[PDB]
Design a protein around this ligand. Structure first.
Ligand SMILES: *[C@@H]1O[C@H](CO)[C@@H](O[C@@H]2O[C@H](CO)[C@@H](O[C@@H]3O[C@H](CO[C@H]4O[C@H](CO[C@H]5O[C@H](CO)[C@@H](O)[C@H](O)[C@@H]5O[C@H]5O[C@H](CO)[C@@H](O)[C@H](O)[C@@H]5O)[C@@H](O)[C@H](O[C@H]5O[C@H](CO)[C@@H](O)[C@H](O)[C@@H]5O[C@H]5O[C@H](CO)[C@@H](O)[C@H](O)[C@@H]5O)[C@@H]4O)[C@@H](O)[C@H](O[C@H]4O[C@H](CO)[C@@H](O)[C@H](O)[C@@H]4O[C@H]4O[C@H](CO)[C@@H](O)[C@H](O)[C@@H]4O[C@H]4O[C@H](CO)[C@@H](O)[C@H](O)[C@@H]4O)[C@@H]3O)[C@H](O)[C@H]2NC(C)=O)[C@H](O)[C@H]1NC(C)=O
Lengths: 245, 43
């Protein structure tokens, strides 16, 4: 009654029969902006079906020597579907997300992942190596899009913060002896109630193998990791022509 | 001590309303209506 689930929203459902449990980030569901909070005076659009779908984005192969990946949300979906068309026309934006990452393996493979969220995941550099040149990260390390980006130094998460206490932020583990998926429901976290969808990326989805993959030779050596996400309770405002960046 | 009627018959337009905050914006919808036009002013 906990191992088996089904998440239907929009026209797309996903079934899982070896889940762990759904955690709701910071204990509350995504919701619409109340009139106590809103400052924009134009009526928002709320598509309510066409953008609240599980978008399956990409597939990272996980071998025995991987480091970890990250996806900046919502810039994984400003190139995809009716979410990517409404977020490019409209200046303002708010939504929550239901984030579901699948990674199946046999009952002989082993290894654990820490799929975790963290809001305002800013990216530092190696500062020129020795630490004296103020190098800023490029635009693709900042906002990789639906392609994702691989961590260089996952012990410090490319930001000088340790991964050992990433477990404070909303997370759950995918260890291949127990579960194969990890649902994380995230509300809209930001100070101001709407923001731009092209500039500001509210959070980043860190997916790091902490305990590495291991399997005896003869088993299937290709163990993919696919993340599917669904913008919940999304609404846009401030209509103008299409910007792409 | 007069019999004339000329002498015996011989003011702000705006009211200061209290306004602590800026005024709210009530919900409007579309309107397809002739006769009345709120945009066309006379400057
Ligand atoms: C001029 O001159 C110049 C100079 O020379 C030249 O150049 C050249 O070029 C060429 C071409 O390109 C080249 O060659 C190539 O190479 C490549 C590479 O190699 C490298 O690298 C690798 C990598 O590794 C990785 O992975 C692994 C697993 O796999 C792991 O373990 C590790 O760790 C790593 O990891 C990393 O990375 C990754 C990526 O992804 C990531 O993710 C992670 O994170 C990490 O970081 C390596 O390994 C190698 O190493 C080597 O070496 C060393 C030394 O030190 C040793 O120790 C080792 O062991 C090795 O050795 C081995 O191996 C190799 C291979 O690799 C071989 O060759 C040798 O002999 C031995 O055995 C390196 O470093 C490669 O890849 C390639 O190969 C390919 O091809 C060939 C022919 O061509 C063949 O034969 C093979 O087989 C292969 O094939 C494959 O692949 C493909 C593509 O990919 C595919 O498609 C196919 O299908 C296949 O697959 C298959 O098979 C396999 C087996 O193998 C299996 O597994 C699978 O499943 C399937 O079935 C090539 O070779 C070169 O290099 C260069 N050079 C140099 C020096 O380098 C030029 O060219 C000229 N010019 C003209 C015009 O000519």
């Amino acid at each position: 009654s906990d191992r088996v689930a089904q998440l239907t929203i929009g026209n797309s459902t996903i079934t899982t029969q070896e889940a762990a449990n759904i955690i709701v980030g910071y204990g509350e569901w995504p919701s619409y902006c109340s009139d106590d909070d809103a400052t924009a005076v134009d009526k928002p659009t709320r598509p309510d079906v066409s953008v609240n779908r599980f978008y399956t984005l990409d597939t990272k192969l996980w071998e025995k020597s991987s480091k970890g990946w990250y996806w900046k949300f919502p810039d994984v979906l400003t190139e995809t579907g009716v979410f990517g068309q409404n977020a490019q026309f409209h200046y303002l934006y708010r939504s929550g997300f239901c984030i579901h990452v699948q990674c199946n393996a046999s009952k002989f493979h082993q290894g654990a992942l820490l799929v975790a969220i963290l809001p305002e995941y800013v990216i530092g550099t190696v500062a020129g190596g020795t630490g004296t040149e103020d190098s800023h990260p490029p635009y693709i390390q900042t906002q990789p899009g639906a392609d994702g980006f691989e961590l260089q130094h996952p012990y410090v998460l490319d930001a000088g913060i340790p991964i050992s206490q990433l477990t404070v932020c909303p997370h759950q583990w995918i260890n291949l002896r127990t579960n194969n998926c990890a649902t994380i429901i995230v509300p809209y976290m930001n100070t101001l109630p709407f923001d731009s969808a092209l500039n500001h990326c509210n959070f980043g989805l860190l997916v790091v193998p902490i305990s590495p993959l291991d399997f005896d030779q003869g088993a299937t050596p290709v163990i993919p990791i696919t993340i599917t996400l669904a913008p919940m309770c999304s609404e846009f405002a401030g209509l103008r022509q299409a910007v792409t960046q | 001590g007069d019999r004339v009627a000329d002498m015996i018959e011989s003011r702000a337009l705006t009211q200061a309303l209290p306004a602590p905050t800026g005024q709210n914006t009530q919900v409007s919808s579309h309107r397809l209506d002739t006769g009345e036009v709120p945009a066309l002013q006379a400057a």
